[PDB]
């Protein structure tokens, strides 16, 4: 009877909130909001750091393709946001 332990569980008097799909619902879109606000907070931070290395750049240093550097950097904030989504989606729907 090894396989019996796939039903190993010690629940108290009250079921874990997580068994309730709504609780996970809340927490999920909670982090989804919490995520959308970071997404911008990071956009801001990139704006600053953009002209923040324009002021430090010497003339012997390579010309920074603002279009290039700001492209990869925005796309990244996108991915990184998307990632963060699925990941909170993971900890609340898949692997909770």
């Amino acid at each position: 009877q090894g396989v019996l332990t796939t039903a190993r569980e010690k629940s108290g008097n009250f079921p874990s909130p997580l068994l309730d799909i709504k609780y996970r619902r809340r927490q999920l879109e909670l982090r989804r909001q919490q995520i959308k606000q970071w997404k911008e907070s990071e956009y801001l931070y990139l704006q600053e750091e953009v002209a923040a290395i324009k002021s430090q750049r010497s003339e012997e240093d390579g010309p920074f393709d603002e279009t290039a550097y700001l492209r990869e950097r925005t796309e990244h904030i996108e991915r990184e946001a998307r990632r963060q989504e699925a990941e909170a989606q993971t900890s609340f729907g898949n692997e909770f």
């Binding site: 009877q1 019996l4 332990t5 039903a7 190993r8 569980e9 010690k10």
Partner: peptide, 29 residues
Amino acid sequence: YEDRIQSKVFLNPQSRVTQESNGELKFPA
């Protein structure tokens, strides 16, 4: 675990062995 306990030990995800009076690790009753 003594045989009588087995099903319980297998299902209590926190059941853990305690030191005993001879020095042997057992699940407790």
